[PDB]
Design an enzyme around this catalytic site. Structure first.
Site, PDB file in Angstrom:
ATOM      1  CG  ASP A  15      -1.349  -0.372  -5.747  1.00 12.71           C
ATOM      2  OD1 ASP A  15      -0.193  -0.229  -6.116  1.00 12.71           O
ATOM      3  OD2 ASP A  15      -2.389  -1.333  -5.675  1.00 12.71           O
ATOM      4  NE  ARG A  29       0.626  -2.079  -3.441  1.00  7.64           N
ATOM      5  CZ  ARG A  29      -0.909  -2.006  -2.786  1.00  7.64           C
ATOM      6  NH1 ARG A  29      -0.903  -1.516  -1.674  1.00  7.64           N
ATOM      7  NH2 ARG A  29      -1.790  -3.429  -2.694  1.00  7.64           N
ATOM      8  CG  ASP A  34      -5.280  -3.983  -4.551  1.00  5.11           C
ATOM      9  OD1 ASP A  34      -4.743  -3.733  -5.079  1.00  5.11           O
ATOM     10  OD2 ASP A  34      -6.009  -4.739  -4.492  1.00  5.11           O
ATOM     11  CB  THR A  35      -5.535   0.976  -6.599  1.00  2.00           C
ATOM     12  OG1 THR A  35      -4.151   1.077  -7.304  1.00  2.00           O
ATOM     13  CG2 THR A  35      -5.644   2.504  -5.775  1.00  2.00           C
ATOM     14  CD  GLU A  37      -1.886  -5.047 -11.237  1.00  2.00           C
ATOM     15  OE1 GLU A  37      -2.279  -5.940 -10.696  1.00  2.00           O
ATOM     16  OE2 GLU A  37      -1.459  -4.424 -12.252  1.00  2.00           O
ATOM     17  NE  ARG A  81       5.112  -3.779  -4.014  1.00  2.00           N
ATOM     18  CZ  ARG A  81       4.235  -4.786  -4.436  1.00  2.00           C
ATOM     19  NH1 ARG A  81       3.729  -3.999  -5.489  1.00  2.00           N
ATOM     20  NH2 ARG A  81       3.427  -5.087  -3.581  1.00  2.00           N
TER      21      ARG A  81
HETATM   22  C1  THP Z   1       0.214  -3.419   0.694  1.00  2.00           C
HETATM   23  C2  THP Z   1       0.957  -4.211   0.576  1.00  2.00           C
HETATM   24  C3  THP Z   1       1.263  -5.599  -0.767  1.00  2.00           C
HETATM   25  N1  THP Z   1       1.706  -6.426  -0.025  1.00  2.00           N
HETATM   26  C4  THP Z   1       1.780  -7.805  -1.186  1.00  2.00           C
HETATM   27  C5  THP Z   1       0.996  -8.865  -0.505  1.00  2.00           C
HETATM   28  C6  THP Z   1       0.666  -9.039  -2.627  1.00  2.00           C
HETATM   29  O1  THP Z   1       1.815 -10.962  -2.711  1.00  2.00           O
HETATM   30  P1  THP Z   1       1.714 -11.238  -3.860  1.00  2.00           P
HETATM   31  O2  THP Z   1       1.904 -10.515  -4.766  1.00  2.00           O
HETATM   32  O3  THP Z   1       2.123 -12.172  -3.526  1.00  2.00           O
HETATM   33  O4  THP Z   1      -0.170 -11.414  -4.375  1.00  2.00           O
HETATM   34  C7  THP Z   1       1.258  -7.830  -3.318  1.00  2.00           C
HETATM   35  C8  THP Z   1       0.022  -6.725  -3.061  1.00  2.00           C
HETATM   36  O5  THP Z   1       1.013  -5.865  -4.175  1.00  2.00           O
HETATM   37  P2  THP Z   1      -0.370  -4.967  -5.680  1.00  2.00           P
HETATM   38  O6  THP Z   1      -1.377  -4.495  -5.409  1.00  2.00           O
HETATM   39  O7  THP Z   1       0.710  -4.302  -6.207  1.00  2.00           O
HETATM   40  O8  THP Z   1       0.186  -6.358  -6.441  1.00  2.00           O
HETATM   41  O9  THP Z   1       1.733  -7.923  -2.326  1.00  2.00           O
HETATM   42  C9  THP Z   1       2.224  -6.650   1.219  1.00  2.00           C
HETATM   43  O10 THP Z   1       3.203  -8.054   1.194  1.00  2.00           O
HETATM   44  N2  THP Z   1       2.328  -6.137   2.054  1.00  2.00           N
HETATM   45  C10 THP Z   1       1.784  -4.906   2.516  1.00  2.00           C
HETATM   46  O11 THP Z   1       1.150  -4.674   2.755  1.00  2.00           O
HETATM   47 CA    CA Z   2      -2.679  -2.688  -6.473  1.00  2.00          CA
END
Ligand code: THP
Ligand code: CA
EC number: 3.1.31.1
Length: 135
Positions: A15, A29, A34-35, A37, A81
């Protein structure tokens, strides 16, 4: 919502990727998904993580055209991102992942939820077919 051209620079995982957008390299992103990790230690290489990365990599690497579509709310998350629905040759990768059971609908933040119902219906189908993450 308007689609704009982007050039793939490097696919990082299921993702997240790096694209040349408006003449500048940026990491994007995928919105609403959510794919699993395959990086971050507080997660490790989760199951289907490698699968989602592979599915995604092929799809974007063999594409003639990549387009980014921002939603109506904020365009970047806290890490800087870009947040968007990305299409590979007119096919939305966000939905593609969800339909194959390689991602879950997640991080739904209004007002960035225009395609939420479309993605939830695809996830439901994936669920009833007990695909990957749903098996
Ligand atoms: C998809 C998305 C992720 N995020 C944030 C929430 C998560 O925060 P935390 O890192 O604080 O958990 C993280 C998830 O991304 P990843 O799935 O790439 O880790 O990015 C957003 O803020 N907005 C969005 O719309
Ligand atoms: Ca992910």
């Amino acid at each position: 919502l308007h689609k704009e051209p982007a050039t793939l620079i490097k696919a990082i995982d299921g993702d997240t990727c790096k694209l040349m957008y408006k003449g500048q390299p940026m990491t994007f992103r995928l919105l609403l998904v959510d794919t699993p990790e395959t990086k971050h230690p507080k997660k490790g290489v989760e199951k289907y993580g490698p699968e989602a990365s592979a599915f995604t990599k092929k799809m974007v690497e063999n594409a003639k055209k990549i387009e980014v579509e921002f939603d109506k709310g904020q365009r970047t998350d806290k890490y800087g991102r870009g947040l968007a629905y990305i299409y590979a040759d007119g096919k939305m990768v966000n939905e593609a992942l969800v339909r194959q059971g390689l991602a879950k609908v997640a991080y739904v933040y209004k007002p960035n939820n225009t395609h939420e119902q479309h993605l939830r219906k695809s996830e439901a189908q994936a669920k009833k077919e007990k695909l990957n993450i749903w098996s």
